[PDB]
Paper text:
In σ54-mediated transcription initiation, σ54 recruits RNAP to genes responsible for regulating a variety of stress responses, including nutrient depletion, membrane stress, antibiotic exposure, and biofilm formation.
The RII-finger conformation is almost identical between 6 and 5 nt and indeed RNA remains short of reaching RII-finger. The ELH density becomes significantly poorer at 6 nt compared to that of 5 nt, indicating that there is an increased flexibility of ELH from 6nt. With increasing RNA length (from 6 nt), the enlarged transcription bubble releases the interactions between the bubble and ELH, enabling it to eventually retrieve out of the transcription bubble.
Residue numbers in the entry:
A (entry chain D): 789 to 932
B (entry chain D): 250 to 641
C (entry chain D): 54 to 102
D (entry chain C): 1 to 1341
E (entry chain D): 1328 to 1376
Write the structure that this text describes.
DNA sequence: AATGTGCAACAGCATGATCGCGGCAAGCTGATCGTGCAAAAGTCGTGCCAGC
RNA sequence: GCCGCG
């Protein structure tokens, strides 16, 4: 299976090589709606895991109408995640890289914070190779 | 397309030379028979043969099931020998064998810091030859470059001192063979050791997927000012603590460190010392080390915690806590600002990574590095003190 | 006029030309009467086509 | 008697529990037997050289009336024995001398001969021979030849798993594989069409070959189908009744039996109606005309009125043709079954597809298909088809092929023609058809009844046969142009093709590889190896999951544990201990017969096929004294499965408990407590252990160590053991006892031990004697133990006091912490020997001379060189000191005055000649062991040559004079007895020499008969001694006939003692490996209450996640054994009286719960008991067989006897702080090995070196000063970091930028650390390579 | 590579060396990380002339 | 009601199938003739003057 | 081409 893993990671690296963070903020309103990953009778992915270190694309509303909890275009860190877990937020609209609409790259805000360091990502970080390596480092432990 | 040399003065024609010679032969024969008013069929046959030869030269293996020769193996034509595996894999495109590089077996050094590695003095003095030449020439020891080369060859004691000097703040970067992710190549400050095996800090092992059962690592020297700053500020083991795939810390205690931390922070119903009251962790360590109390004994200890509730300020609270001797001893290691509730458990490799994560998210980077080093030290020490063993 | 040639592809050894008519650094870019070899750095054996 | 002399010296405590029926075999039967069958004469041409010779000879010219008749052959005596042959570097081989004669026949008189020239033998070829250990010393190497596992020739049906067309339709294909030739394939098209594939070409309709065998359409339809008859008389149109065939069918109309209704229209189709119809005897009955509409006419009825007829086979019938045949008088019409219930429409479709129906048409079609060139002329197609199949020479499947062919088709006969007939193709086609219908089943291809083993003999025979046919094609030519003067040497003997083919196979082949030399275990494992690769085998990439898996028939034939790890897993295996080969070559395994309910002792060897039907018991089944089974319901294997069966149902029983595991894996004690993968790694790791300075027996063994040590051949084993007469560190001389003696010339046995000698892996091969003096020795005892052997018992490691505990992180992961006492006691110190060679070869400018005087080199370097220019024996060299001084001359003929001044001031050479001397390669050290200078015939002898030759003469005469002295002493004794019988002068007769002038004459009879015969015998003895000594001296001193260019060869040996160090790799035999981390001082290690410190500290965390409980059990058993040894050594220290020592040793040996070992010291006298106790002082070498060894209770009670804690754990005190560790620590004695992976050969570093001519990048690997490869993924990681400048310097300056390298070096030496990058040469090379195509690529601005 | 070069050779296209593998092959600073800053200086000069 | 067109199934062919590292032999194996003549170049046996 | 190492 190591040969298959190596070939897969080669393909991923080559498809994703030409992608670096080039802009501070594209300014788009587009985003991706995120909800806890649920199937059947058990919880699999809580919203805290799926939203941590991402930038909100729209204002999050408490079930009480017309109460702005966290403002638009902000980075969610452990404090924000804990605050939204204290309330009952269930779906959060956070911008993702598939809607950055910038040319030959990705906005530093559409892409969340880099997982290696707590701060938001800096311009010029080659994120395609990092993503390919992260996806391809496992696979040697996937039972095919 | 160099010619293969052989025994004596005889030379062996290589692949492309054979293909070119064949093409030239057929072209010359066709040219000579064109002017002889040869019949149409022989001219046609020679034209076909020339076309076939040119195709075999330009890309062998198709249209004629290869042309082979002298080994019953297809001949390596122009297309096949582009670059290694026909692409740019081997001798281009990130495939270069690099100079100023070495390789050796890795062993465990528990005395190291998080940013240090062990480099043999024989492996150095060979990676750092031009630097040592420069230092010898600049100190006035060897004026001519020949004198410096001879002095390094004879390896006097002054060469060793100068080598120790040039190593001082020059990070060298080690990597393991299957560099799966980016944490598989990291820059450490070398420490010269008398040996032949590279000594690797245990904590980083999980990043490398490296066990000390015959693994080998390669050492590269970043011989430039910009490269040195890049190794120090981008590839240092103190820089990449969290894995850039999920954000969870990747330099975490493993194996013996976890066993030591778990054995230290446990309790038993009856032990030496029960409900005894201690003025602080120092008294707990004194009681354990001198033998008047057990690591698992349950006591009441006066503990002072620090909170960062104020805006960037640490405020202290002192309280009497029901804990064990081992947890109190461990508390002398946690940096100020973390609650005592992170120690009042068993710390089974899930609490310890969580406590490192909270240290990173609350205190910063450098206190977390100091904390990780101290955790590894104390875990090894108390695992050895524990004497845990497997029996039938 | 061979596959390995000295009139083309440049010289074989340093600045020396075949037959040793002009073989030194004093002569440069000169083509011998006997052999069409020119005196140059013989690193052009990797470039002349 | 009960115990041999060598076993009496140290008796292991076997744990047994089950008597062994048959002992382990030779362990080398495969290679020795295969080569013996290949070489030895056979009066029937069954196998070997004689078989090939009878296959080829006799051969005659094309009606030339001249023949070569073959009569027997012979192999000459080898010129050099294996020792000298390995020393010089020549192949160990023997000549072939074949006796053949010419017969020239009469041209005028048919079948008559006119000339018969019977010349002597003619020489061709040089056949290598295998030594007594099963190795071919060729070109001065070892070169074991590995057995091959391939597909036995025959017929194989396959199902391709039924996923080809994604329609779910299963396609069955049959394949005929010859031993030598081209295969046949029959395949099914999902549209249900037969297809035939010859030589794996495109598919063709199958009926072409049937037409090619002179088979008409009617005949093939009759052969491949059964035919029924429809009778239409008086418009009745009756049908024959076949109730068996009418199983599933719908009644289209009323069915009446003899005018009475039997089955209604669409009535019940159950078996009851069929049985009722069959019970009633009913003749043919009328049937509706609608049913016959779908039928197809089989035969071709002929009209009696006109020649026109309906011969269209595979055609249906119309209403008009019914009237036509009625007019023609066709009362009965033959039509095939056309019934699809179990059968089906087949064959007819293929013939409908292809319209050819004539033999010539089929032959021309197949000739065009096979050969797409020129069409034939009735002669090329026929010859081509003859050459494919039913050809005596072009096609041949061997006897195993014919056997498999007959068995697959259930034919009673087994022996048959090794060539295809016309009927077997029909039979295999019908078998494919029937397996399609459902009768029969597809067979497994991995089954060991379908995989054969080719050993050395068969492959050598095949290569010799290839060479032989090649020589025959040549010798056939000349016979038409040869007169009566031609002789066999001139008969185109042509030794060159034969010798070239055999040497090419033996030296450079896929399955003839360097034999590993670490330990005797790795040797013995490599010798008995099964390889699935090879010429006629399969490649690594072309093998799927299924081929490299463990098939249920692998039980007692192929080891399930021992196999390489990464690429070759499952493709390389080792035979089990007991597996052998059939007469055909399939693997068989011993078993014990069961009669009634008892287990008898007769042993039957069962193959893979035969064992499938018998019910086979298990090795560990309890038995009573009478042999019956203790329990009624026992475990068994019936057909590739296992279950519980009754006591009277079984048919065979396992012979022993080592049947499953190989020789390598049967050495791991407590194997049953190890994970299968960890056991695999341990077995593969035992073979890499390096022999140590001193062998140390395993305290915990298995008992197979004696077998490995003895049958590996490294040791010296007696063959006519009597009483040892002389012992030396080099020789052992034994006087054979009188009970066995060859009459005449008396006889003694001399064993010359091989002293320090390099192995293939550059270890040391050393033999030291085991016997002292006057010690009786029996046949089969060991005299000297080779590398890593102790008293004839395999000892490839050392016993180390191992404590399982984490220690300050120094045994993190798998690292191993070692005490300084291990280094101090010189354990794990290994001697490594290296080769260096120098050649004095001729040159255009003159001859190369080896002289001590080397120009330009001073006296200091020449200090270690003698007057001949070669280093002194025992000189310690390192770095680059000169070993031999060789001088290369230079050509100078334009005599110039400056050279005159140079020649005048300095010597006559004036250092004109260059020097090219042998220097130690850098980084190598050692002491010179031996120098092996060889000289050419005619060239003057070197100074050291006379010394070496005189040493050889002195050794030869010293070794040969012993028998001379014995014989002369015997003759003198006989003469003394004779003179005592008459005229005895007592000591005076012994005072004078020559028996005091033969004691005059004395009596007439004694003088004429006794004295004369004694003198005659004495003078004949003197003469034979003189002549044999002269012959030996002439043999030793001669000029070697080396290569034409070379005039002198010099070989220098170096030896260096590598001591253990942190980087070194150490491992136990339970898969637990590691590298050392620290060499702790003695006082820092943990110690027990007795103050004795441990030697090795291991990590316990490596036990539970790896599942090696063999580790812990071996540790406890070693602790118990060392406890008993300590008790014995204590009772020996205080000089305790013998009887109590005997009683204690008896108590130790009488332990265990019903063990089969019954060693009793009552029969032992005092001396042997004292010797044994002194031998058990270090510990009791107790042994546990593989799967039935020591139990928990036995280990605990063994510990109890030695006054050790039964828990196996003691209290350990810290060596640095003195505090007791909180928990008890497991301490014992584990037997550890030092693998060949040392940091001395694995540390490398480079800063500048030599670069490749093209691409100008650094070379690769050590021994060439290479740089580490910055591969693709490394650059990916650097890009992920964002490291642009480091990446740029790694891509241009460090590697490929030609000017960037020099600029960067100058900047560093200056101290600038500036890059100044540039243009990699690799990209310029790529641009030139692309431009050399028809493509223009440039650099724009 | 046979297919990619063939379609590139016919179309007569150019690379412009914008990605990472293009710059690594020719030994230039990659446009990511510490080389990102250097690549921006070159881009503005190209636009300005 | 016979006819032409567009869509789909089956066969053949191209492509690629992890990264480093260490050690050992044997192939690595490799030739276009002669031609017979001027034309040139070189070489050899011989005689020359200049130094001791 | 073979063998092994992680
Ligand atoms: Mg490893
Ligand atoms: Zn964006
Ligand atoms: Zn010239």
């Amino acid at each position: 299976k190591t040969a298959n893993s190596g070939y897969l990671t080669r393909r991923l690296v080559d498809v994703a090589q030409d992608l670096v963070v080039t802009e501070d903020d594209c300014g788009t309103h587009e985003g991706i709606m995120m909800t806890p990953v649920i199937e059947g009778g058990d919880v699999k992915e809580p919203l805290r895991d799926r939203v941590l270190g991402r930038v909100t694309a729209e204002d999050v509303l408490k079930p009480g109408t017309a109460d702005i909890l966290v403002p638009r275009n902000t980075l969610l860190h452990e404090q924000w995640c804990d605050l939204l877990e204290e309330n009952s937020v269930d779906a959060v609209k956070v911008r993702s890289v598939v809607s950055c609409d910038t040319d030959f790259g990705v906005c530093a805000h559409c892409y969340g914070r880099d997982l290696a360091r707590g701060h938001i990502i800096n311009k010029g970080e080659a994120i395609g190779v990092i993503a390919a390596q992260s996806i391809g480092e496992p696979g040697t432990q996937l039972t095919m | 397309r160099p010619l293969v040399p052989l025994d004596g003065g005889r030379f062996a024609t290589s692949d492309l030379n054979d293909l070119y010679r064949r093409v030239i032969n057929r072209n010359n024969r066709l040219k000579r028979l064109l002017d002889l008013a040869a019949p149409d069929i022989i001219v046609r046959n020679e034209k076909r043969m020339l076309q076939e030869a040119v195709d075999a030269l330009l890309d062998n293996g198709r249209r004629g099931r290869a042309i082979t020769g002298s080994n019953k193996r297809p001949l390596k034509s122009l297309a096949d020998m582009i670059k290694g595996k026909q692409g740019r894999f081997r001798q281009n495109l990130l495939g270069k064998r690099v100079d100023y590089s070495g390789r050796s077996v890795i062993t465990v050094g528990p005395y190291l810091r998080l940013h240090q590695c062990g480099l043999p003095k024989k492996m150095a003095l060979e990676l750092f030859k031009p630097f040592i030449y420069g230092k010898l020439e600049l100190r006035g020891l060897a004026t001519t470059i020949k004198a410096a080369k001879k002095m390094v060859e004879r390896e006097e004691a002054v060469v060793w001192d100068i080598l120790d000097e040039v190593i001082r703040e020059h990070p060298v970067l080690l990597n393991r063979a299957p560099t799966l992710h980016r944490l598989g190549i990291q820059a450490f400050e070398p420490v010269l050791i008398e040996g032949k095996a590279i000594q690797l800090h245990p904590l980083v092992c999980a990043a490398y997927n490296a066990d000390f059962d015959g693994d080998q690592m390669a050492v590269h020297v970043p011989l430039t000012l910009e490269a040195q700053l890049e190794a120090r500020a981008l590839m240092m083991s103190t820089n990449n603590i969290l894995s850039p795939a999920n954000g969870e810390p990747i330099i975490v205690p493993s194996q013996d460190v976890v066993l030591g931390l778990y054995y230290m922070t446990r309790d038993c119903v009856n032990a030496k010392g029960e409900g005894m009251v201690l003025t602080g962790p120092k008294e707990a360590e004194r009681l354990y080390r001198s033998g008047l109390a057990s690591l698992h004994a349950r006591v009441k200890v006066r503990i002072t915690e620090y909170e960062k509730d104020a805006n960037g300020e640490l405020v202290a609270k002192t309280s009497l806590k029901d804990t064990t001797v081992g947890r109190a001893i461990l508390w002398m290691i946690v940096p100020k600002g973390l609650p005592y509730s992170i120690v009042n458990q068993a710390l089974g490799k899930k609490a310890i990574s969580k406590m490192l994560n909270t240290c990173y998210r609350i205190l910063g980077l450098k206190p977390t590095v100091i904390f990780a080093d101290q955790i590894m030290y104390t875990g090894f020490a108390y695992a050895a003190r524990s004497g845990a063993s497997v029996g039938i | 006029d061979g596959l390995f040639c000295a009139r083309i592809f440049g010289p074989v050894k340093d600045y020396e030309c075949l037959c040793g008519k002009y073989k030194r650094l004093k002569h440069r870019g000169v083509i011998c009467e006997k052999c069409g070899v020119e005196v140059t750095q013989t690193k052009v054996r990797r470039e002349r086509m | 008697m009960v115990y041999s002399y060598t076993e009496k010296k140290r008796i292991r405590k076997d744990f047994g529990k089950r008597p062994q029926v048959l002992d382990v075999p030779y362990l080398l039967s495969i290679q020795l037997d295969s080569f013996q069958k290949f070489i030895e004469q056979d009066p029937e041409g069954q196998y070997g050289l004689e078989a090939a010779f009878r296959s080829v000879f006799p051969i005659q010219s094309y009606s030339g009336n001249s023949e070569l008749q073959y009569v027997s052959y012979r192999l000459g005596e080898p010129v050099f024995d294996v020792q000298e042959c390995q020393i010089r570097g020549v192949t160990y081989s023997a000549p072939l001398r074949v006796k053949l004669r010419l017969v020239i026949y009469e041209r005028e008189a048919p079948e008559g001969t006119v000339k018969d020239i019977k010349e002597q033998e003619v020489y061709m070829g040089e056949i290598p021979l295998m030594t007594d250990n099963g190795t071919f010393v060729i070109n001065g190497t070892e070169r074991v030849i590995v057995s091959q596992l391939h597909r036995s020739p025959g017929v194989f049906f396959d199902s391709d798993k039924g996923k080809t067309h994604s329609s779910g339709k299963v396609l069955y294909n049959a394949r005929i594989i010859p031993y030598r030739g081209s295969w046949l394939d029959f395949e099914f098209d999902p549209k249900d069409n037969l297809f035939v594939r010859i030589d794996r070409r495109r598919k063709l309709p199958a009926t072409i070959i049937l037409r090619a065998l002179n088979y008409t359409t009617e005949q093939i339809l009759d052969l491949f189908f059964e035919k029924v008859i429809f009778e239409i008389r008086d418009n009745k149109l009756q049908m024959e009744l076949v109730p068996e065939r009418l199983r599933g069918e719908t009644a289209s109309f009323d069915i009446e039996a003899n005018g009475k209704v039997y089955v209604e229209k669409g009535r019940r189709i159950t078996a009851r109606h069929i049985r009722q119809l069959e019970k009633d005897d009913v003749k043919l009955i009328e049937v509706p005309v609608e049913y016959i509409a779908g039928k197809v006419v089989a035969k071709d009825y002929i009209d009696e009125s006109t020649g026109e007829l309906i011969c269209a086979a595979n055609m249906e019938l119309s209403l008009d043709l019914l009237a036509k045949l009625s007019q023609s008088g066709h009362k009965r019409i033959e039509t095939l079954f056309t019934n699809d219930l179990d059968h089906g429409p087949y064959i007819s479709e293929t013939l409908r597809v292809d319209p050819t129906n004539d033999r010539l048409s089929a032959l021309v079609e197949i000739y065009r298909m096979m050969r797409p060139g020129e069409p034939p002329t009735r002669e090329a197609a026929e010859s081509l088809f003859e050459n494919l199949f039913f050809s005596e020479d072009r096609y041949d499947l061997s006897a195993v092929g014919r056997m498999k062919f007959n068995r697959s088709l259930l034919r009673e006969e087994i022996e048959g023609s090794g060539i295809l007939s016309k009927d077997d193709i029909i039979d295999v086609m019908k078998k494919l058809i029937d397996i399609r219908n459902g009768k029969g089943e597809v067979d497994d291809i991995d089954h060991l009844g379908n995989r054969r083993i080719r050993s050395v003999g068969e492959m050598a025979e095949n290569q010799f046969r290839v060479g032989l046919v090649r020589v025959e094609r040549a010798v056939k030519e000349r016979l038409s142009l040869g007169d009566l003067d031609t002789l066999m040497p001139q008969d185109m003997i042509n030794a060159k093709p034969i010798s070239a083919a055999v040497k090419e196979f033996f030296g450079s082949s896929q399955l003839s590889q360097f034999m590993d030399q670490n330990n005797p275990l790795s040797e013995i494992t490599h010798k008995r190896r099964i390889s699935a690769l090879g010429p006629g085998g399969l490649t690594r990439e072309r093998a799927g999951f299924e081929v490299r898996d463990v098939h249920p028939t692998h039980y007692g034939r192929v080891c399930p544990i021992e196999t390489p790890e990464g690429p070759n897993i499952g493709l390389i295996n080792s035979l089990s201990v007991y597996a052998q080969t059939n007469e055909y070559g399939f693997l068989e395994t011993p078993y014990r017969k069961v009669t009634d309910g008892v287990v008898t002792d007769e042993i039957h060897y069962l193959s893979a096929i035969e064992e499938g039907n018998y019910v086979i018991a298990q090795a560990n089944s309890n038995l009573d004294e009478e042999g019956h089974f203790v329990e009624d319901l026992v475990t068994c294997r019936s057909k590739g499965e296992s279950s519980l069966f009754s006591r009277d149902q079984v048919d065979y029983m396992d012979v022993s408990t080592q049947q499953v595991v190989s020789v390598g894996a049967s050495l791991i004690p407590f194997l049953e407590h190890d994970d299968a993968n960890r056991a695999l790694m341990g077995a593969n790791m035992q073979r890499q252990a390096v022999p140590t300075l001193r062998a140390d027996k395993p305290l915990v063994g298995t008992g197979m160590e004696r077998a490995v040590a003895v049958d590996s051949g490294v040791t010296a084993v007696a063959k006519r053991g009597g009483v040892v007469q002389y012992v030396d560190a080099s020789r052992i001389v034994i006087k054979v006892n009188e009970d066995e003696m060859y009459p005449g010339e008396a006889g003694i046995d001399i064993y010359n031990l091989t002293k320090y000698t390099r192995s293939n892996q550059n270890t040391c091969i050393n033999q030291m004697p085991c016997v002292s003096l006057g010690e009786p020795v029996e046949r089969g005892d060991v005299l000297a133990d080779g590398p890593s052997t102790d008293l004839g018992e395999l000892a490839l490691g050392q016993n180390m006091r191992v404590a399982f505990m984490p220690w300050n992180g120094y045994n993190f992961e798998d690292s191993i912490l070692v005490s300084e006492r291990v280094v101090q006691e010189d354990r794990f110190t290994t001697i490594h020997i290296q080769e260096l060679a120098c050649v004095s070869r001729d040159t255009k400018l003159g001859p190369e001379e080896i002289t001590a005087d080397i120009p330009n080199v001073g006296e200091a370097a020449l200090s270690k060189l003698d007057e001949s220019g070669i280093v002194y024996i025992g000189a310690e060299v390192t770095g680059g000191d000169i070993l031999v001084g060789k001088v290369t001359p230079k050509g100078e003929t334009q005599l110039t005055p400056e050279e005159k001044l140079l020649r005048a001031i300095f010597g006559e050479k004036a250092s004109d000649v260059k020097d090219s001397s042998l220097r130690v390669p850098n980084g190598v050290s050692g002491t010179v062991i031996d120098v092996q200078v060889f000289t050419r015939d005619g060239v003057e002898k070197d100074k050291r040559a006379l010394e070496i030759e005189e040493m050889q003469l002195k050794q030869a005469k010293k070794d040969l004079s012993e028998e001379l002295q014995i014989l002369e002493a015997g003759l003198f004794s006989r003469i003394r007895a004779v003179l005592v019988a008459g005229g005895v002068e007592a000591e005076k007769l012994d005072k004078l020499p020559r028996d005091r002038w033969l004691e005059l004459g004395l009596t007439d009879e004694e003088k004429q008969n006794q004295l004369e015969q004694l003198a005659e015998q004495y003078d004949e003895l003197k003469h034979e001694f003189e002549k044999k000594l002269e012959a030996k001296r002439r043999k030793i001193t001669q000029g070697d006939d080396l290569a034409p260019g070379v005039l002198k060869i010099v070989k220098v040996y170096l030896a260096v003692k590598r001591r253990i160090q942190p980087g070194d790799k150490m491992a136990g035999r339970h898969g637990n490996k590691g590298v050392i981390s620290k060499i702790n001082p003695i006082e820092d290690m943990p110690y027990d209450e007795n103050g004795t410190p441990v030697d090795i500290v291991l990590n316990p965390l490596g036990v539970p996640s790896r599942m090696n409980i063999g580790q812990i059990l071996e540790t406890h058993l070693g602790m118990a054994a060392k406890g008993i040894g300590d008790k014995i050594n204590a009772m020996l220290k205080q000089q305790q009286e013998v009887a109590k020592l005997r009683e204690f040793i008896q108590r130790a040996y009488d332990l265990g719960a019903d063990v089969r070992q019954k060693v009793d010291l009552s029969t032992f006298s005092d001396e042997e008991v004292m010797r044994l106790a002194e031998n058990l002082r270090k510990g009791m070498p107790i042994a546990t067989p593989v799967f039935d060894g020591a139990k928990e209770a036995e280990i605990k009670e063994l510990l109890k006897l030695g006054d050790l804690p039964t828990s196996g754990q003691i209290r350990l005190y810290d060596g640095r702080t003195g505090e007791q560790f909180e928990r008890p620590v497991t301490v014992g004695y584990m037997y550890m090995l030092k693998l060949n992976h040392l940091v001395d050969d694995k540390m490398h570093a480079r800063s500048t070196g030599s670069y490749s001519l093209v691409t100008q990048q650094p070379l690769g690997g050590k021994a060439q000063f290479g740089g580490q490869r910055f591969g693709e993924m490394e650059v990916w990681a650097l890009e992920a970091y964002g490291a642009a400048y480091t990446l740029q310097e790694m891509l241009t300056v460090k590697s490929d930028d030609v000017n960037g390298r020099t600029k960067m070096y100058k900047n560093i030496v200056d101290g600038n650390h500036q890059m100044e990058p540039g243009m990699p040469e690799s990209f310029n090379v790529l641009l030139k390579e692309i431009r050399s195509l028809g493509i223009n690529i440039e650099l724009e601005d | 590579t046979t297919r990619v070069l063939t379609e590139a050779a016919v179309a007569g296209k150019r690379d412009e060396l914008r990605g990472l593998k293009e710059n690594v092959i020719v030994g230039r600073l990659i446009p990511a990380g510490t080389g990102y800053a250097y690549h921006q200086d070159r881009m503005r000069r190209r636009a300005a002339g």
